[PDB]
RNA sequence: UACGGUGCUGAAGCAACAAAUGCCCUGCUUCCAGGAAAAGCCUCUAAGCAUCAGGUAACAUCAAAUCGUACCCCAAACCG
RNA sequence: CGAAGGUGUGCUGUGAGGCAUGCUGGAGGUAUCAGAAGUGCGAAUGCUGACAUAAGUAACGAUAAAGCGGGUGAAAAGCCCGCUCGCCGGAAGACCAAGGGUUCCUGUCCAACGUUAAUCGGGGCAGGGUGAGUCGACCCCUAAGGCGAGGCCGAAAGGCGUAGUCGAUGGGAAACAGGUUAAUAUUCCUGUACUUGGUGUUACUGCGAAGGGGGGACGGAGAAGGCUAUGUUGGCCGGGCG
RNA sequence: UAAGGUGAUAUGAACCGUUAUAACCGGCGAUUUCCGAAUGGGGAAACCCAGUGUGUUUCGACACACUAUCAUUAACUGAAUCCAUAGGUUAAUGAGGCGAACCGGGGGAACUGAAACAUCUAAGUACCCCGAGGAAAAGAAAUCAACCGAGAUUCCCCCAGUAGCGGCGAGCGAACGGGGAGCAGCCCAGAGCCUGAAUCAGUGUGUGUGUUAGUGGAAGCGUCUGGAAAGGCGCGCGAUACAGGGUGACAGCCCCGUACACAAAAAUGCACAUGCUGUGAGCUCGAUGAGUAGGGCGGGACACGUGGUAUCCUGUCUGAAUAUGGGGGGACCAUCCUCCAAGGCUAAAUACUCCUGACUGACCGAUAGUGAACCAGUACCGUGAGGGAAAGGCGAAAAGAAC
């Protein structure tokens, strides 16, 4: 499934508005890559597939306090 | 919370028999009573060999409506309603005229 | 050792007919309408209690119920259970 | 019968009820013959039953 | 001329029995459609 | 019996009738 | 003899020839288009067991449950 | 002391209509003045039910074929018994699977069904009838294929699929002859067998698998040879002498 | 509560009971086969085959319990790999499925209309899916207003078919403000000080009020017609009861009831009260929600179709200040006003009716009204999903026609 583990996010739908105006139904998937993060707290890597949103993130908060948030949200990692 | 029981000497008050009197012999949950002489009719009985019986025109008595019927009450000759109280912790019956209970 | 309860709980009836009657009183066997989870075991250990009899061995078959119409409406009786049962020689029962 | 059955033993009931069940059996092979006559025997006997299994539920795990 | 029923009852069951329709979610639907409506028979299975 | 009616109409319709039997294109 | 039947008794009961599309044949020969699986069965050991367990050999004994079995089935009983 | 409704008659109004009354019917009806409408039917190849018409007409379902006597019976072309005749005979005979699901047998009935009658019936009603260690299923095994712990994927539903687990149409132990019932029989009976599991003694002593190997285990066509089923003839026995 | 009962077609048989364990009604209990989420494995639903353990055994074997999956937690164990981790196993708790409408959300049509049609409309409709509750949702201003001020949310009447949007077509269509229903506010991003202080939750008890069986309940005779009186004609009576229904024709006074008056061993709802358990109250000083706001691109929502388009959401790329700061006031700037986002909770008024009870109808009265007044979602049809009927009335009483 098309979703960031860090961020939720999530294909939607829109349009394809042409030049007249013709909406077509499309969808908007998110930048989703596998990554493996090294955890040095745990000393192992840990892959993650993550938008690159999340690896803005994860550059900006850190590994270890979005693993806390994916383990208070439930979420197996 | 029955006014006119099994063993009652009844009146009729309505029918073909509107004045005669005399017992219950029982009474049905239809709210009809048998009253003993009285409703006769004359059903043309068939034979059964089994039953030991020759078939014939019985005359017997047919059920009627409790609506039709009051409880005699022998001292002023007449018929009385029932109407109920507790004598001694114990629901009886007693006549609505004179207020004396039903024995 | 089957329970005395289910013992009692297992024969229903005897089955009178002209071919119980005939196997009564040729190969020494009983007709018995029986109940229908009852097995042959049970059987055999129920007429050699309740009846205090020597039974050999039992033959089982299962009636299958007929389809019947009271008035106009229709209806299906019950599957009943038959058993044969093989009275060992010189054993006699009513 | 159910205050005269509350004054008896588990073992007294079990020996009532076995007792119960032979005369059903014996019953029920008479009625299967023509020669039962008495056909309220076979719910008078069904409901002691029951009576009884209902005594030993209550005697036991009760 | 071969007509078009020929019965089977391992496929008459296989194909449209009531495990085959609690396999499936749509087939859940038409046995709570057939319970609402009240139907005898819910399905061909005996 | 209607509901053998039933059968009447619901298919000596569904018999679908077969067709024209003059084969003639009025061209 | 209920004329339906039931009971008793009971001769000979061999050979030759022909002979299958059936059997030997899951064979043989040959061809190319190159012709299921798994278990039962047989056997081998592994850890384990060490004279116990188990194994086969004989004998004895017990058990073999449950369900179907009627009837039509190229048809008046199936699909029309 | 007879309502509505139904059916007639008489009268009346320009009309839609109105009034009275006879019969039926046997218990509801409602003035006036206002109010509200599922408010007026001949048509819609209109909808539903009933009845006509054609018409006592066509047809009565393979051109295999019937005839007679007797019986039963209210009644016999059709049922039963009998003697003839004809038809199939690689089927129009017999056994099954699938499928149906009591149509089987016996008694009784003939309203309906049966393209006629019906005493008959696969029809109505009642009763009876299906007996397995060896047949089959179940069961052990798997095929195509299905499901599918986890898993991978996917807006959700869900899709695929590993381990596995289902799944025969295929692989896997074992019973034959004779007799018998109105109806069951390789199931019952008589006779003679067989198989696999158990426990238990006795002798003997390497047992052990989720593993290894073997086997199971496999095509088409063709050619003969050896046989049997089976048949024919002879012999034999019993009967016959037209 | 009771003198009558053993449900109906549907008689009969054999019985029970009549002053109280006959029956009947209610409350709490017990049993509750098999399938089915179905949950021991499988499975063509109502079937097949087991394992472990504890018991019995007349050794033939019987009975009972447990054994699904996932999530979370705990224990033990445990690879490649040293630790470790993954994994494994036990145990405990919970979930799973069904169900009418209402609700929130994820997706999301077309016919049609435009007298064609493509933007637009239909319409965020139908439909599918997910989740929840008795309601949900929203909700306590980074709001409106306009230099006066208001003061959460939700609902109704206006504003107003206005302003606007719009192939400026068809059509879509507000808000400010006003009147009402109802009203309720709080907490964490943090330390202390006083300490248990408000409130809430649970669990008991007590009281009250319901509910789940029930009790009492007024008062009419005569005559006529007639098959039968409840009708007619007389003469009375009741009424906090002339609601209604039944009774051989239309009954205030015949019956059931009604008005009114009461009633619960037991279970339970709702209120209070209180006990216990948990919960913290208040004061001071602080702090004040960053990959966020905003921006670029592409879309969507706002009545607003990119237009001069504010505001909201975000798939993508970026990216602040941070109380001396920031947002909004419909492009935009300046001034002024107003508010404090990037964390949450929250009753009411509101929406609906599978179901229960009472009552009502200028609603139907058997081709109507539910498809169904009657054994109807039946018969029947269809492989199947699914479709889907017809069919009421003897009489007061069977007295249902002996012979
Ligand atoms: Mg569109
Ligand atoms: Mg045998
Ligand atoms: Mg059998
Ligand atoms: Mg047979
Ligand atoms: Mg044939
Ligand atoms: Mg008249
Ligand atoms: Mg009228
Ligand atoms: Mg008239
Ligand atoms: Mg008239
Ligand atoms: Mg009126
Ligand atoms: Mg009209
Ligand atoms: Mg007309
Ligand atoms: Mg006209
Ligand atoms: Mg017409
Ligand atoms: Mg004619
Ligand atoms: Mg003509
Ligand atoms: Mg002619
Ligand atoms: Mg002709
Ligand atoms: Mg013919
Ligand atoms: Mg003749
Ligand atoms: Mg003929
Ligand atoms: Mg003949
Ligand atoms: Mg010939
Ligand atoms: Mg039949
Ligand atoms: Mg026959
Ligand atoms: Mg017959
Ligand atoms: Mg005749
Ligand atoms: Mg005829
Ligand atoms: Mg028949
Ligand atoms: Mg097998
Ligand atoms: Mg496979
Ligand atoms: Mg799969
Ligand atoms: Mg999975
Ligand atoms: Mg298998
Ligand atoms: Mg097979
Ligand atoms: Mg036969
Ligand atoms: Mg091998
Ligand atoms: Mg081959
Ligand atoms: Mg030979
Ligand atoms: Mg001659
Ligand atoms: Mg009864
Ligand atoms: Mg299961
Ligand atoms: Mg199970
Ligand atoms: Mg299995
Ligand atoms: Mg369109
Ligand atoms: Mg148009
Ligand atoms: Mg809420
Ligand atoms: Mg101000
Ligand atoms: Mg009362
Ligand atoms: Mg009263
Ligand atoms: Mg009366
Ligand atoms: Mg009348
Ligand atoms: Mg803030
Ligand atoms: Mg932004
Ligand atoms: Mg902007
Ligand atoms: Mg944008
Ligand atoms: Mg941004
Ligand atoms: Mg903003
Ligand atoms: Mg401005
Ligand atoms: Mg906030
Ligand atoms: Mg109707
Ligand atoms: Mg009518
Ligand atoms: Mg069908």
Redesign the pocket.
Same mark, same amino acid.
């Given at each position: 499934?098309?979703v960031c583990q860090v961020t939720g996010?999530?294909?939607?739908?829109?349009?394809?508005?042409s030049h007249?105006?013709?909406?077509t139904?499309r969808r908007?998937?998110?930048?989703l890559h596998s990554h493996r993060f090294w955890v040095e707290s745990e000393k192992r890597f840990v892959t993650l597939?993550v938008?690159?949103?999340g690896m803005?993130?994860i550059?900006?908060?850190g590994i270890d306090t979005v693993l806390a948030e994916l383990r208070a949200r439930?979420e197996?990692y | 919370?029955?006014?006119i029981?099994?063993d009652d000497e009844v009146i009729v008050?309505?029918?073909?028999?509107?004045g005669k009197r005399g017992k219950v012999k029982?009474?049905l949950?239809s709210?009809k009573v048998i009253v003993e002489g009285i409703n006769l009719?004359?059903?043309?009985?068939?034979?059964v060999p089994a039953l030991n019986q020759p078939?014939?025109?019985v005359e017997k008595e047919?059920?009627?409506?409790?609506?039709?019927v009051?409880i005699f009450n022998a001292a002023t000759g007449k018929?009385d309603?029932?109407?109920?109280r507790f004598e001694d912790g114990?629901?009886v019956r007693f006549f609505?005229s004179n207020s004396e209970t039903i024995k | 050792?089957?329970?005395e309860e289910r013992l009692l709980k297992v024969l229903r009836a005897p089955?009178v007919?002209? /071919? &119980?009657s005939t196997?009564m009183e040729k190969?020494n066997?009983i007709?018995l309408k029986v109940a229908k989870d009852a $097995? /042959? &075991?049970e059987i055999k250990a129920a007429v050699q209690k309740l009846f205090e009899v020597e039974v050999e061995?039992v033959? $089982?078959?299962?009636?299958?119920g007929?389809?019947?119409?009271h008035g106009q409406?229709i209806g299906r009786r019950s599957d009943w259970?038959?058993a044969?049962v093989?009275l060992k020689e010189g054993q006699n029962l009513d | 019968?159910?205050?005269?059955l509350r004054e008896k033993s588990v073992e007294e009931l079990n020996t009532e009820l076995l007792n119960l069940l032979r005369e059903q059996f014996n019953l029920r092979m008479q009625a299967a013959s023509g020669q039962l006559?008495?056909?309220?025997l076979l719910k008078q006997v069904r409901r002691d039953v029951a009576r009884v299994k209902?005594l030993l539920?209550e005697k036991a795990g009760? | 001329?071969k007509?078009?029923?020929?019965?089977?009852?391992?496929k008459?069951?296989?194909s449209?029995?009531?495990?085959?329709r609690?396999a499936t979610?749509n087939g859940?639907?038409?046995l709570?459609?057939?319970?609402?409506?009240?139907?005898?028979?819910?399905?061909?299975?005996? | 019996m209607?509901?053998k009616?039933?059968?009447i109409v619901?298919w000596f319709n569904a018999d679908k009738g077969f067709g024209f039997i003059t084969p003639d294109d009025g061209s």
């Amino acid at each position: 499934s098309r979703v960031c583990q860090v961020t939720g996010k999530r294909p939607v739908t829109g349009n394809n508005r042409s030049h007249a105006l013709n909406a077509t139904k499309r969808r908007f998937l998110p930048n989703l890559h596998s990554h493996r993060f090294w955890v040095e707290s745990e000393k192992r890597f840990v892959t993650l597939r993550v938008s690159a949103k999340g690896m803005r993130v994860i550059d900006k908060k850190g590994i270890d306090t979005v693993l806390a948030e994916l383990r208070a949200r439930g979420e197996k990692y | 919370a029955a006014k006119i029981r099994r063993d009652d000497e009844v009146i009729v008050l309505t029918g073909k028999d509107k004045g005669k009197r005399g017992k219950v012999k029982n009474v049905l949950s239809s709210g009809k009573v048998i009253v003993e002489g009285i409703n006769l009719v004359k059903k043309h009985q068939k034979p059964v060999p089994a039953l030991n019986q020759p078939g014939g025109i019985v005359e017997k008595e047919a059920a009627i409506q409790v609506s039709n019927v009051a409880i005699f009450n022998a001292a002023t000759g007449k018929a009385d309603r029932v109407g109920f109280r507790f004598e001694d912790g114990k629901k009886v019956r007693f006549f609505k005229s004179n207020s004396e209970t039903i024995k | 050792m089957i329970r005395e309860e289910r013992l009692l709980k297992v024969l229903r009836a005897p089955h009178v007919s002209e /071919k &119980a009657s005939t196997a009564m009183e040729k190969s020494n066997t009983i007709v018995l309408k029986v109940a229908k989870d009852a $097995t /042959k &075991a049970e059987i055999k250990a129920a007429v050699q209690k309740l009846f205090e009899v020597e039974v050999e061995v039992v033959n $089982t078959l299962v009636v299958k119920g007929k389809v019947k119409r009271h008035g106009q409406r229709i209806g299906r009786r019950s599957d009943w259970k038959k058993a044969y049962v093989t009275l060992k020689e010189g054993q006699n029962l009513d | 019968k159910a205050k005269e059955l509350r004054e008896k033993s588990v073992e007294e009931l079990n020996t009532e009820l076995l007792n119960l069940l032979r005369e059903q059996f014996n019953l029920r092979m008479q009625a299967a013959s023509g020669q039962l006559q008495q056909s309220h025997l076979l719910k008078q006997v069904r409901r002691d039953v029951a009576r009884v299994k209902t005594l030993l539920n209550e005697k036991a795990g009760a | 001329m071969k007509r078009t029923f020929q019965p089977s009852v391992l496929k008459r069951n296989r194909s449209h029995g009531f495990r085959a329709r609690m396999a499936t979610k749509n087939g859940r639907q038409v046995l709570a459609r057939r319970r609402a409506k009240g139907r005898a028979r819910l399905t061909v299975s005996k | 019996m209607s509901g053998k009616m039933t059968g009447i109409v619901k298919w000596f319709n569904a018999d679908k009738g077969f067709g024209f039997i003059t084969p003639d294109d009025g061209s």
